[PDB]
Structure 1
Amino acid sequence: GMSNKFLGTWKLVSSENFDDYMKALGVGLATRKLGNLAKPTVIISKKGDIITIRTESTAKNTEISFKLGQEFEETTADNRKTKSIVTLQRGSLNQVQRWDGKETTIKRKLVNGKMVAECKMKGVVCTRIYEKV
């Protein structure tokens, strides 16, 4: 299952191309400004087979809980209401969100003790790097 090394609190330390990823998602300028400045924490926890990923920032807080492989409804930081599924593939937590005939993917993997989130929307790619607090 998910490596226990995912568990704990992560702090954003670097990000590339997040503005364009937000643009692709239909996020407006005022909110993109927050997104490009914010350095959120991401808290990952688990109870039984339920994984929880909480994101905390002044910009916005979000929280999802899920079982691997099972679709759930999600409200995203930019207020999209999506049908989402997270699966584990070769160590990576692969989140797919679907809404309005659109889809985006966020893959989270552990690389060199960091958590690397790779986000893709119609060919626009960003990467966000987190360090463990």
Structure 2
Amino acid sequence: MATVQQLEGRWRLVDSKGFDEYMKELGVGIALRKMGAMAKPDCIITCDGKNLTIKTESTLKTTQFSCTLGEKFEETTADGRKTQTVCNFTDGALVQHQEWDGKESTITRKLKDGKLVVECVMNNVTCTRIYEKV
């Protein structure tokens, strides 16, 4: 018995795995990759019913989106991509699908050992983003 509300709270990055390779796959330039690779974002996740809000905060940039689960919406990512996106909660994991310019990326968010595991995949390049509850 798992629900999207299990992901709510305030989270802080504690481990990164393959993030540079994921940014390279997005085409992010060297300057922003150096900036991105030193950030330790803080994330606040809230979900009232099906209305979900994720606000990501760091010393470099603050980003946030609000959406209804299962309903598509437009999101401008931290690296500047204007994407068509939908979020679905399925099998104890929040699934975010991003499309832009004929390219796809999937971002999954799930709890593992109490840590929020964020997996970003694009063109078979997998990035793992580990957050601790604060």
Q: Tell me the TM-score normalized by structure 1.
A: 0.95
The answer to whether structure 1 residue 13 and structure 2 residue 14 are counterparts is yes
User: Matched residues in 1 for 2:92 and 2:49: separation?
Assistant: 18
Helix, strand or coil for the counterpart of 1:30? helix
Q: Could you tell me whether the CA contact under 8 Å between 1:2 and 1:93 is conserved in 2?
A: no
Identical residues among aligned pairs (%)? 56
User: Matched residues in 2 for 1:7 and 1:104: separation?
Assistant: 23
User: Matched residues in 2 for 1:108 and 1:98: separation?
Assistant: 18
| Mapping 1:17-36, distance limit 5 Å | 17-36=18-37
Correspondence for 2:47: 46
| Mapping 1:43-82, distance limit 5 Å | 43-82=44-83
Alpha-carbon offset, residue 35 of structure 1: 1.1
- Alignment RMSD, CA only? 1.1
> Unaligned regions of 5+ residues in structure 1, if any?
none
User: Matched residues in 2 for 1:127 and 1:60: separation?
Assistant: 20
The answer to whether structure 1 residue 83 and structure 2 residue 89 are counterparts is no
1:14-49 CA deviation, whole Å, 9 max, x = no partner?
001100101111111111111111110111012342
Correspondence for 2:108: 107
Q: Could you tell me whether the CA contact under 8 Å between 2:4 and 2:93 is conserved in 1?
A: no
Report the residue type matching 2:79 in the other structure: D
Q: Could you tell me whether the CA contact under 8 Å between 2:115 and 2:130 is conserved in 1?
A: yes
Alpha-carbon offset, residue 5 of structure 1: 2.4
Alpha-carbon offset, residue 117 of structure 1: 0.4
> Unaligned regions of 5+ residues in structure 2, if any?
none
Q: Tell me the TM-score normalized by structure 2.
A: 0.95
